[PDB]
Structures are given as C-alpha cells and as structure tokens.
C-alpha cells in the first residue's frame, strides 16, 4: 500500500538536479577547520583570508568531481555500474598522479 520508488530511479533524479545547480556541496565550517588543521601542521600561527578558503573549496570540489567522473568511466568499462576503490586507484594511476 505505501508508495516507494524502485531502487535506483531516484538516484538519476539526484544526478539531474545536482548537475543543474552551481552552489558548493561541502559544508563551510568543516572544510575551513580541515584547512586550518593542515596549515597549522605545516606552519603554526597562520591566518586565512575568506577568499583563500573559498578558492580552496572550489579547487577541491572541481578536482573531486573530475576524479569521480573518471572513476565512473572506468567502472562502466569493467562491465559494472558500481564504483569501487580499485577503479579510483586505476584512474589515478593512469592520470599520472601516483604512477
């Protein structure tokens, strides 16, 4: 009696929705805290301009989007629809990031 969508028919709706929007997808404070942690690991007592954090978020999001696109391509090439970590390392190695 209750109405439930079949598995996988709402994921495509999410794909269609998210490829239409442009806003960021990672919450601001967690990313800012992570950036501050890494920076203070490198050199202590640093201050960040807000524009720098925004630029870092844009770059990280674009890089991850590209990586996931290539991972999905590899997973499809392996006659599957699910992305697995081995796809991620294969794509990264072919791109030359780790060799």
């Amino acid at each position: 009696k209750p109405h439930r969508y079949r598995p996988g028919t709402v994921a495509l709706r999410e794909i269609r929705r998210y490829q239409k929007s442009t806003e960021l997808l990672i919450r601001k404070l967690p990313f800012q805290r992570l950036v501050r942690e890494i920076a203070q690991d490198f050199k202590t007592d640093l201050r960040f301009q807000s524009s720098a954090v925004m630029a870092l978020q844009e770059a990280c999001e674009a890089y991850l989007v590209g990586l996931f696109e290539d991972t999905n391509l590899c997973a499809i090439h392996a006659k599957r629809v699910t992305i697995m970590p081995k796809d991620i390392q294969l794509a990264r190695r072919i791109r030359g990031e780790r060799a």
Partner: protein, 82 residues
C-alpha cells in the same frame, strides 16, 4: 591544536559530489579512499601556498597565494584574482 577533522567531509557530501559527477551507485568503501585523496590534494596545495606566504614575510594566506599555487600545479583557476 586540532585533530580528527577529516570526518567533517561527511558521507552525504561525497554522495552529492558523486551525484554531480554522474554516478548512479556507490560502493561502501569509496568514502575512505575519497577522504585520503582529498587530504593528499589539500596537503599538496597548502604546502605551496604556505611557502608563497612565508617568502613575502607575511602572516596571512591571501587568496592570491592559493590561486598562484594552483596555477603552478597546473590547475589554473579564474575568479578570485590573478
């Protein structure tokens, strides 16, 4: 001092990134690898950014330093200066 902030990149965030990338189904072990690669990329960028900041005898990492490091790495960015 801060610790264990990599968990701030939550599972729904990686899910949304995959959904934008064009992914229908995600395995359960993707998230750890995604967090690892994100940490590696962030470390690589911040090293150059902090080096640029420290060279100029400053103390604040302006957006110009970050965009300049990104341009050096081969990932040129438009919008925040340059």
């Amino acid at each position: 001092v801060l610790r264990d902030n990599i968990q701030g990149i939550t599972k729904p965030a990686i899910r949304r990134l995959a959904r934008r990338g064009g992914v229908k189904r995600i395995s359960g072990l993707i998230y750890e690898e995604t967090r690892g690669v994100l940490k590696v990329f962030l470390e690589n960028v911040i090293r150059d950014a902090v080096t640029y900041t420290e060279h100029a005898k400053r103390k604040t990492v302006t957006a110009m330093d970050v965009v300049y490091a990104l341009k050096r790495q081969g990932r040129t960015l438009y919008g925040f200066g340059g």
